[PDB]
Write a protein that binds this ligand. Structure first.
Ligand SMILES: *[C@@H]1O[C@H](CO)[C@@H](O[C@@H]2O[C@H](CO)[C@@H](O[C@@H]3O[C@H](CO)[C@@H](O)[C@H](O[C@H]4O[C@H](CO)[C@@H](O)[C@H](O)[C@@H]4O)[C@@H]3O)[C@H](O)[C@H]2NC(C)=O)[C@H](O)[C@H]1NC(C)=O
Ligand SMILES: *[C@@H]1O[C@H](CO)[C@@H](O)[C@H](O)[C@H]1NC(C)=O
Ligand SMILES: *[C@@H]1O[C@H](CO)[C@@H](O)[C@H](O)[C@H]1NC(C)=O
Ligand SMILES: *[C@@H]1O[C@H](CO)[C@@H](O)[C@H](O)[C@H]1NC(C)=O
Ligand SMILES: *[C@@H]1O[C@H](CO)[C@@H](O)[C@H](O)[C@H]1NC(C)=O
Ligand SMILES: *[C@@H]1O[C@H](CO)[C@@H](O)[C@H](O)[C@H]1NC(C)=O
Ligand SMILES: *[C@@H]1O[C@H](CO)[C@@H](O)[C@H](O)[C@H]1NC(C)=O
Ligand SMILES: *[C@@H]1O[C@H](CO)[C@@H](O)[C@H](O)[C@H]1NC(C)=O
Ligand SMILES: *[C@@H]1O[C@H](CO)[C@@H](O)[C@H](O)[C@H]1NC(C)=O
Ligand SMILES: *[C@@H]1O[C@H](CO)[C@@H](O)[C@H](O)[C@H]1NC(C)=O
Ligand SMILES: *[C@@H]1O[C@H](CO)[C@@H](O)[C@H](O)[C@H]1NC(C)=O
Ligand SMILES: *[C@@H]1O[C@H](CO)[C@@H](O)[C@H](O)[C@H]1NC(C)=O
Ligand SMILES: *[C@@H]1O[C@H](CO)[C@@H](O)[C@H](O)[C@H]1NC(C)=O
Ligand SMILES: *[C@@H]1O[C@H](CO)[C@@H](O)[C@H](O)[C@H]1NC(C)=O
Ligand SMILES: *[C@@H]1O[C@H](CO)[C@@H](O)[C@H](O)[C@H]1NC(C)=O
Ligand SMILES: *[C@@H]1O[C@H](CO)[C@@H](O)[C@H](O)[C@H]1NC(C)=O
Ligand SMILES: *[C@@H]1O[C@H](CO)[C@@H](O)[C@H](O)[C@H]1NC(C)=O
Ligand SMILES: *[C@@H]1O[C@H](CO)[C@@H](O)[C@H](O)[C@H]1NC(C)=O
Ligand SMILES: *[C@@H]1O[C@H](CO)[C@@H](O)[C@H](O)[C@H]1NC(C)=O
Ligand SMILES: *[C@@H]1O[C@H](CO)[C@@H](O)[C@H](O)[C@H]1NC(C)=O
Ligand SMILES: *[C@@H]1O[C@H](CO)[C@@H](O)[C@H](O)[C@H]1NC(C)=O
Ligand SMILES: *[C@@H]1O[C@H](CO)[C@@H](O)[C@H](O)[C@H]1NC(C)=O
Ligand SMILES: *[C@@H]1O[C@H](CO)[C@@H](O)[C@H](O)[C@H]1NC(C)=O
Lengths: 120, 434, 123, 120, 120, 48, 48
């Protein structure tokens, strides 16, 4: 489908077209300012992914466990009976905590790898 | 044994110059082109960091200067341009029976002036201050501006009250605050702290005496680029403020006329009472004590067996020979000679002031400004927070000097430095890439 | 001044479990990697397990990879080892030792610098 | 700690907060020009890391040996008795050489991997 | 050699200096607009590589087979007897197809890796 | 050949009275109007 | 000799020489310049 065609699709189906939305983020002083701001926001999202250990990835698995209090729904209800727009609302109050946990777990992983490589 | 390891995010920096942005919470210095401030700005103390500061090479001063010039010109541009005032004026004394100061200072000048229609002229009577009117040779006079520049009339709706402005670093840069008590102005600081933005700085314009600035915390601090070189100015930051009460006691009125299809001119009207001299009061004991503190600290750079003498200014026009300030929107010029006449060997002081409407700010030639008169009696209270002194045998004579507005901002920006972050470096570690 | 004090268990039977613990003093606990070395009553020394200074990387000798868990608490200055199954061949003195690893920014070790006196574990 | 809080910390302690400084690099023609220049410099640093084989990493180990002449200090003096500000000065005259060596070793690694993958 | 020095070199020789050209992509309203556009195009190329699974790489191997119809030349003629300027012309009509195939194969690889990691 | 992608099962809330597009369109029209009239004859001599 | 189209007489021909020709140009008269004020900050310069 096309840009945002999956907006009404379930999460487990909508994830099939992540590339379609990813490619549409980069594609008269006010307009130049808007373009510079769009570039800065793109780079902020790429930096945020980079500091989590997710570089050239659209789907990236991490080692942060789900704490249940964020959302205690069954896995099949989240992926088969929900859209991404609804999910973005259910956990809108927990994204800062998750982001902090991801940053800390990446710092621990990078330090452990640096030490592991030293074993001659 | 050891291998190169690359680190990104390294907390190091280099000296750099860049463009800082305005942040501030009509008014000439409070335009919409300024970012709202952070209600809770951060400050991070840097332990065991001793950075070297140099207030005399600080690029933030030139940017602040240019930004103020830009805001000033932008505010005055969309206003009435009074080219029709370069006409012959026929002037007599306003108050021929006055036996006090202001005798001959206010002149009642008649001129024609244009009207809404190009085919008709009117007859206008208005009062001008002596300082704005020069004789041609009831006498014929012209405005001083007709010698060098047309005047743009300031819009009466735009206030000249100072509003604090915060300067903020762009992403990738940081501002380091000295926080070193009794800071020399140059050299290492032991209490360097990183801030997102500077404190609010009021764009207060004055000569000879710095007003509404920051005070020293421990003692009077005397700073200069070079003390030995007599061509440099000395900025003295006081640890206490001196209260200044300035006034224009006359109950002045304002009249206005139309001068064209959408333009109007405002002018000095009658006086609803006696004509009185504008003036300003300073406490005598407080000033004498403050000057004593200044000499006590000043002797440290010259010797304890010297004589420090103060004297008034010498040459120049009222922009540099007198103290000047914006009080209530009116522009005052004050003599000050009563403040700097003393020899220091090992209840109220009243200074006369003149009002001038034709203004040539920023030491520019060719861009004159006309200040509209303000109706009513003007009174304001200011704080002296610092002095400007210049040097001129065991006796050293000091004079107010001043006149270069950047010297009025270094006294506030002396504690900030701009650095660039370069978060990339290498170091040896026992770590090989397989 | 460096001391490691074992506070272990006694006799268990095969199929059970036993937890050993060591207390450290005289040095910064979090600055050194620590390990366990086993010595059967009539045999020589062998390495059993190694834990790094942060308690994030653990290594085991093949014979115990599926049986022993090594952990540390840097706030308590406590090292502990949870041993399962405990067969007859595991009777030995278990010594705590400081050394055996260095976290990349420290100089090389690859040796056991300090030793405790040893807990006696029997089956 | 906060932004640059580790500036006076030792290298072996200061490295614990690399993320804190990394996140503060992205966070009226003169101001727009300053923003564009900041973006270009950020991208130049990311490209420089990319050509060394260090993409989504804050700590990255390489195969370039230390030549000692750059700095002959003991490893424990550099990491425990120095700050990053001092270290940046001790080797300020050698960073171009190290960068060139890193670029060459990455070119060799990429070519060797390309050939190694061809062994059916 | 210097910037574009390899333009007349064969493909198998020209590939030795990819870093030299890569480093020259980042190194008055009209000029500011040109700089912003150059940044956007750089980011579009980096995003395009990222969605193919080629992040911090100058040479990146993929799992898309060559279909021969795109070019049926012997491997040694392409790499030893051609320049990159000529090659860019021979297959100028097929690059959109190849790019689509690369995007699809990366989507399949990322989904398969996500499922493979779930095997406890 | 501009594109339109129908969004199935999407029910977004609209508010035409708080739509920021109106203020931009207004300002853009004012700007174009003033730019077009600026480089033209200024008839100050008619105030006769 | 270069041109967009030699046959088309509407195009210009640019001839680039391989040697330079030296040109000595002069205004021999010892001309003076006078000036007057014309307004509040303006002055006009004229042939004297
Ligand atoms: C140093 O700081 C002091 C303040 O700490 C400053 O003195 C203050 O100046 C302002 C502006 O001149 C004074 O504010 C005025 O107060 C009078 C009171 O009668 C008002 O009538 C004035 O009204 C104006 O603003 C109104 C805004 O609503 C308008 O409606 C009106 O038409 C006028 O335009 C104005 O509010 C303030 O009172 C003094 N403070 C004191 C204690 O006197 C001083 O000027 C600063 N130094 C320098 C050099 O500027
Ligand atoms: C919308 O709802 C229908 C009916 O439940 C469903 O078949 C379809 O997959 C949903 N999503 C889209 C994008 O149409
Ligand atoms: C889950 O979140 C709550 C707070 O919302 C916290 O108290 C709890 O410790 C968290 N659980 C885990 C395992 O981190
Ligand atoms: C104003 O213009 C009239 C024109 O007749 C002239 O007579 C008069 O003197 C002018 N006023 C002044 C003050 O010059
Ligand atoms: C007029 O300007 C000149 C310089 O341009 C100055 O010398 C002269 O004094 C000015 N006139 C008066 C009356 O001040
Ligand atoms: C620097 O900071 C310390 C700690 O706050 C303080 O004791 C010291 O006096 C400061 N230095 C100066 C010169 O103020
Ligand atoms: C200001 O400094 C002087 C020393 O020059 C000192 O005697 C005085 O007490 C100080 N005032 C304050 C308020 O600290
Ligand atoms: C600051 O201290 C230094 C001492 O190194 C001195 O040379 C310099 O003149 C001082 N600055 C002032 C303004 O006194
Ligand atoms: C300060 O001025 C004096 C003037 O004679 C000069 O000799 C001295 O070198 C100046 N200081 C510096 C640091 O240049
Ligand atoms: C000035 O005169 C006006 C006349 O209406 C009066 O209202 C006002 O109060 C007077 N102000 C003073 C300070 O005398
Ligand atoms: C100026 O003098 C004239 C003389 O008739 C007088 O009418 C006028 O009121 C005077 N100006 C003022 C402001 O009083
Ligand atoms: C200035 O005015 C204040 C009250 O506003 C008064 O307390 C102070 O003594 C005055 N100072 C002088 C020098 O008049
Ligand atoms: C007041 O001024 C005199 C000089 O006229 C001076 O001797 C005296 O010390 C001054 N008072 C103070 C407190 O400084
Ligand atoms: C200040 O007043 C004195 C008289 O007390 C006078 O000699 C001096 O010239 C005046 N200064 C100025 C700048 O008007
Ligand atoms: C002037 O100084 C007094 C302290 O004597 C202070 O309370 C007041 O706020 C100061 N005024 C300004 C405008 O800073
Ligand atoms: C600063 O020095 C003290 C004393 O040596 C030390 O404990 C501290 O870790 C150092 N670093 C910082 C950031 O305070
Ligand atoms: C170390 O650097 C020197 C030049 O500073 C060079 O001559 C020497 O060969 C280098 N050593 C190695 C192993 O590359
Ligand atoms: C150019 O042609 C010559 C002769 O065939 C060949 O040796 C050379 O490698 C080619 N490429 C370059 C860059 O000179
Ligand atoms: C090769 O391309 C042709 C179209 O140009 C297509 O029909 C054919 O199926 C392709 N071969 C493969 C193996 O995909
Ligand atoms: C350049 O050469 C071509 C031959 O292909 C010729 O057709 C063309 O006219 C020439 N250009 C000029 C300006 O003579
Ligand atoms: C050059 O001009 C002639 C004019 O008749 C025209 O016929 C010819 O086609 C032109 N050349 C080209 C390449 O169009
Ligand atoms: C032109 O006349 C002036 C008159 O002062 C003289 O100085 C100058 O030399 C003359 N120049 C020539 C070329 O005659
Ligand atoms: C133009 O003619 C007048 C006639 O009186 C003469 O005075 C003047 O000098 C002439 N102009 C010049 C430049 O000589």
């Amino acid at each position: 489908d096309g840009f945002l065609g999956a907006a009404g699709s379930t999460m487990g189906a909508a994830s099939m077209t992540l590339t379609v939305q990813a490619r549409n983020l980069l594609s008269g002083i006010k307009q130049l300012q808007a373009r510079v701001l769009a570039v800065e926001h793109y780079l902020r999202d790429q930096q945020l992914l980079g500091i989590w250990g997710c570089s050239g990835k659209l789907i990236c698995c991490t080692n942060v466990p789900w704490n249940s209090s964020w959302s205690n729904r069954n896995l099949s209800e989240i992926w088969d009976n929900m859209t991404w727009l609804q999910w973005d609302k259910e956990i809108s109050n927990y994204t800062q905590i998750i982001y902090g946990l991801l940053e800390e777990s990446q710092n621990q992983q990078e330090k452990n790898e640096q030490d592991l490589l030293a074993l001659d | 044994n050891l291998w190169v390891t690359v680190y990104y995010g390294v907390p190091v920096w280099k000296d750099a110059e860049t463009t800082l942005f305005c942040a501030s919470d009509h008014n000439v210095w409070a335009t919409h082109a300024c970012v709202p401030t952070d209600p809770n700005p951060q400050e991070i103390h840097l332990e065991n960091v001793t950075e070297e500061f140099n207030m005399w090479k600080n690029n933030m001063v030139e940017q602040m200067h240019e930004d103020i010039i830009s805001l000033w010109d932008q505010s005055l541009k969309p206003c009435v341009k009074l080219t029709p005032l370069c006409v012959t004026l026929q002037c007599t004394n306003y108050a021929p029976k006055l036996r006090s100061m202001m005798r001959g200072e206010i002149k009642n000048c008649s001129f024609n002036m244009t009207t809404e229609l190009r085919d008709k002229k009117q007859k206008v009577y208005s009062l001008f201050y002596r300082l704005d009117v020069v004789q041609i040779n009831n006498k014929e006079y012209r405005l001083i501006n007709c010698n060098t520049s047309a005047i743009t009339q300031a819009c009466p709706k735009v206030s000249f009250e100072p509003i604090p402005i915060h300067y903020c670093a762009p992403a990738g840069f940081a501002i380091l605050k000295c926080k070193d008590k009794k800071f020399n102005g140059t050299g290492p600081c032991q209490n360097v702290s990183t801030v997102q933005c500077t404190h609010g700085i009021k764009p207060v314009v004055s000569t000879q005496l710095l007003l509404n600035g920051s005070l020293a915390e421990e003692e009077v601090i005397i700073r200069s680029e070079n003390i030995t070189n007599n061509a440099k100015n000395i900025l003295v930051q006081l640890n206490t403020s001196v209260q200044i009460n300035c006034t224009r006691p006359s109950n002045n009125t304002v009249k206005s006329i139309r001068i064209g299809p959408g333009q109007a001119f405002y002018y000095f009207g009658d006086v609803l009472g006696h004509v009185r001299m504008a003036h300003c009061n300073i406490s005598k004991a407080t000033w004498n004590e403050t000057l004593g503190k200044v000499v006590k600290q000043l002797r440290k750079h010259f010797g304890n067996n010297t004589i420090i003498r103060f004297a008034q200014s010498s040459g120049g026009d009222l922009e540099v020979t007198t103290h000047s300030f914006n009080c209530g929107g009116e522009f005052f010029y004050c003599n000050t000679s009563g403040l700097f006449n003393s020899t220091w060997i090992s209840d109220s002081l009243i200074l006369p002031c003149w009002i001038k409407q034709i203004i040539n700010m920023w030491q520019r030639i060719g861009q004159a400004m006309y200040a509209p008169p303000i109706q009513g009696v003007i009174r304001c209270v200011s704080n002296i927070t610092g002095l400007i002194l210049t040097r001129d045998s065991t006796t050293e004579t000091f004079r107010p000097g001043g006149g270069d507005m950047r010297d009025n901002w270094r006294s506030e920006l002396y504690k900030y430095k701009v650095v660039k972050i370069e978060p990339l470096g290498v170091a040896p570690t026992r770590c090989k890439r397989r | 001044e460096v001391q490691l004090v074992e506070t272990g268990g006694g006799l268990v039977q095969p199929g059970g479990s036993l937890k050993l613990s060591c207390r450290a003093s005289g040095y910064t606990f979090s600055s050194f990697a620590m390990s366990w070395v086993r010595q059967a009553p009539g045999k020589g020394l062998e390495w059993v397990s190694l834990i790094n200074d942060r308690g994030g990387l653990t290594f085991y000798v093949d014979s115990v990879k599926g049986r022993f868990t090594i952990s540390r608490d840097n706030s308590k200055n406590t090292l502990s080892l949870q041993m399962h199954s405990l067969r007859d061949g595991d009777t030995a003195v278990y010594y705590c030792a400081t050394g055996g690893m260095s976290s990349a920014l420290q100089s090389s070790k690859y040796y056991f610098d300090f030793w405790g006196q040893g807990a006696l574990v029997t089956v």
